[PDB]
Design a protein around this ligand. Sequence first.
Ligand SMILES: Nc1ncnc2c1ncn2[C@@H]1O[C@H](COP(=O)(O)OP(=O)(O)O)[C@@H](O)[C@H]1O
Ligand SMILES: [Mg+2]
Ligand SMILES: [Mn+2]
Ligand SMILES: [Mn+2]
Lengths: 357, 366
Amino acid sequence: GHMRPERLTVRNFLGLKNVDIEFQSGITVVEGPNGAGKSSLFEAISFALFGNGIRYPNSYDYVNRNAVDGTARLVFQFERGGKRYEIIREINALQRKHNAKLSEILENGKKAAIAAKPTSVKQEVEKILGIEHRTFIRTVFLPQGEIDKLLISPPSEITEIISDVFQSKETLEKLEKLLKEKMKKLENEISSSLEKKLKEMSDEYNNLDLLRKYLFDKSNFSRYFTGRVLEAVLKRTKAYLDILTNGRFDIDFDDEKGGFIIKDWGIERPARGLSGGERALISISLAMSLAEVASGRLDAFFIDEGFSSLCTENKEKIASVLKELERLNKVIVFITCDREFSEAFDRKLRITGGVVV
Amino acid sequence: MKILHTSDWHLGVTSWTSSRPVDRREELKKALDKVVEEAEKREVDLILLTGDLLHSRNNPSVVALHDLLDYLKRMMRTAPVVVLPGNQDWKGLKLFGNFVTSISSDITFVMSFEPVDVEAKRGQKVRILPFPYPDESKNEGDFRFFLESRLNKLYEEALKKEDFAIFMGHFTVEGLAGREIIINRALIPSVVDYAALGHIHSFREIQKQPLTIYPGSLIRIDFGEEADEKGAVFVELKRGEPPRYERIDASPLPLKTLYYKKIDTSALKSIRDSCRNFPGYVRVVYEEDSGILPDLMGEIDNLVKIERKSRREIEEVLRESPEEFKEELDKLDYFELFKEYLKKREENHEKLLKILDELLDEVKKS
Ligand SMILES: Nc1ncnc2c1ncn2[C@@H]1O[C@H](COP(=O)(O)OP(=O)(O)O)[C@@H](O)[C@H]1O
Ligand SMILES: [Mg+2]
Ligand SMILES: [Mn+2]
Ligand SMILES: [Mn+2]
């Protein structure tokens, strides 16, 4: 793994003024009044890592227009492979400068630059993280209003991010080109008791051709792989649906039927046809399942205001199911301003007026 | 001494809310009424209520509260009552409980581990040793540790009794059928004359020494409770003698589950004949349906719930323990999964893996 957020510090970003908070494992619910800056927090992370948020197209739109000192500063600290990283950005409205900086933290007060300039920082962060911005918001960073994005994604995108979450695509990329080089040197050595040295050198080569085959015909093991993982995920999702809906709702994956297929009492129902509440309940189970199966790979799970459309009896039902996440030393954050959903959890980060209160 | 022990009322509950709402009030008030009348008949000396008298921890009906307070008032008229709130009782009840015990000697609430001495109708001296429900919240360890200390102290305090000592607990004991602290029955100090429990809906005699009872709920709350017994308990206690008790049956509406694999014209027949003159409520669980049941449920009033038999293969994975969990996910690695793909489709060569192994050992040095 073991991607894991540590510290977030924010100044004058969107609706946030000054916030400095530390991420515990288990569940925190982030609460406060509308426009308090709850979502701003979640966006700050997205922005820290990738240099964009959900809500505006231009960096400088993110500057807190209600601060006289028109400079946003984001400091984000995470972890991955026993290593600590820290990212620093500043956005200045007047200047229209975007500054970004990535460095490792170490043996003590120690800092090892990896990138300045926001293009390089994005580059290196994807590298570090292994996943793309797109797979990040569809999996464990579920942005407000977009709870159902994965659920209604094209099968292409679905598999393309199962792979991304589960592969170690860089370990893979070094492998594929270590093979070419291993086979070419061997081919070279062949094009030049001698039959015995040749036997071994050719024996060794044809394995390598095999290993190459069952590994980069893609449409073979890759598909096989994603299927088996989706199976593990949908297995859990179906279980959660059985709890939450008395077995009324079911879900499956079929690349030819367009992706995730929902059935109500055996009957196919397009996601757009569900009640708002049902869509939420299904997206949440799916996401929650993904995060379980992705334990080890990903150590964080955020839901940004995804509980509103739930009715009182689904709210409890769903809180109850989400506590079963408390088992995985994941950092888990739910943003909500709802009493009935928050009563269920113990630890609260309250924000009002762009600060912690 | 003569005691009425009742618990787990759940005033304010309506069942199958999602599905087909049934407000249980009418049934429940009939049960309560019959239990109260019986208390008057026996002219008991003491009334013990061991929690979950209300259904909602957070948003309690004004009708529920009204009902509860009225029942408390009726009960007080016949004998002093002692109340131990449960985990589902409204958070504010304790506050009112506290307020009101400093005001009448006919009602007393206990909300800590702190023992209190009360006097029954004919002046019997009673020491109440309370064990409230244990907040969820190694750490478990320290909490069980803390909870033993509290049980130790109740024992000490039971020894200083005058006439009677009674344990009042609200929790689950070991041996039935999630994230609760389960408490072994052996931990309940034997020197008490009676151990009144609540929280569990089926009447259950936990142990004879000390006499430990859950009286159970007064209504069948959901279909798991189709067979068990519903009522309160009458208990007589005498200094010299062993304790005697007697269930007081609530006679609640029956519940019933119909099991079918295929919903054909035949199942369609049974279902109708089953619900026909049933004073109770019915659930059907099924395997295969053609859309009959949702339509059916609509038109049969006492058919309140339908439900797909959950696959065993689906039941497991949520039980499945951190032992099984780590194996499962680690069996999901891109390479250890790649194992069986090979062992399946070219079977014979596993040096290929030894080939692969060093190959991956190689790159991880770059
Ligand atoms: N560029 C900006 N500068 C200052 N405030 C902004 C900017 N863009 C949005 N806001 C405001 O910041 C506040 C916080 O929004 P938000 O975090 O989405 O609220 P919530 O706490 O409901 O999640 C809102 O009042 C919003 O209108
Ligand atoms: Mg918002
Ligand atoms: Mn209880
Ligand atoms: Mn109960």
